[PDB]
Amino acid sequence: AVASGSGEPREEAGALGPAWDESQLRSYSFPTRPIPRLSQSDPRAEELIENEEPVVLTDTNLVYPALKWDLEYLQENIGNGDFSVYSASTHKFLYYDEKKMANFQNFKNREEMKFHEFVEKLQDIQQRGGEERLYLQQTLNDTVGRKIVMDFLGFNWNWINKQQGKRGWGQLTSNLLLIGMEGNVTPAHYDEQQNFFAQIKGYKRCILFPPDQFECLYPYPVHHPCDRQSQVDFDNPDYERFPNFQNVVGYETVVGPGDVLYIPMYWWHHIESLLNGGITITVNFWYKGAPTPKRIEYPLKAHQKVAIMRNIEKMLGEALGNPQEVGPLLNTMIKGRYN
């Protein structure tokens, strides 16, 4: 009963029926509990953010002008820039840090193109029945056209600037534009920055796990190209390699046009564009977190321990002269000593 997932789907204004239905949600092995949906003016929402717990805000007006966005308007106005477009064989996009692909030898799609090229490929695949999937993920730069600049100016900067300030966060590092095909899945990973995830078109189911479920989610090695992503395939979890995935409990919600999901720093998130829900548009706002206090306050937060583990992996990579030695050394350290 408390495993309520995203709950019974919302009704759209003017009796236009449910936004989505449970048939559009993929099916997974683990329980989940709802993320709260609150007004930005609600004290509890501020309490959640202050505490680095996720909340969905319903009424920020953060990206009000972008609500008109759709492929036709974007292609008319987004300029002649190149757009990074990731490709995939299945719904599951796994992403690669390319600087890290030298680290690792035994290793194996990004493509740059114009917006019109992107739309045409979707258009093609659509009327040709192909299985290929595409995800545009491009940070918004200055090539963008007159009307996009204008929309962007009309974002609710008063609100978000106030948050950055209330929270002591660092700088806004980027806005990423994401345009996905229905069914697209970004698998469980974590980011080291604070995120406002501003939904614009279509619906996305967001499954979050707290930083203290690191032991259940089995992130790739730091020097691996898939740094920060879970090794576990949620569709076919290998419980022999990943036994504690049997203990994983998530927080979930479905976001649509106008909702903002606060994804706290180091929270795992798994993001899926609803099946048969059409194309999805989202813009993220990433901020560096607050600086680390004084010296330290113990107990120590889960995300500080994650930070400790990343740094040990990184330093041992420098010291050994070879990221591949990390694992063999780590094992020599614990076997028969700490396990």
Ligand SMILES: O=C(O)/C=C/C(=O)O
């Ligand atoms: O919306 C996505 O597909 C991914 C978002 C993220 O990783 O923040």
Ligand SMILES: [Fe+3]
């Ligand atoms: Fe992310």
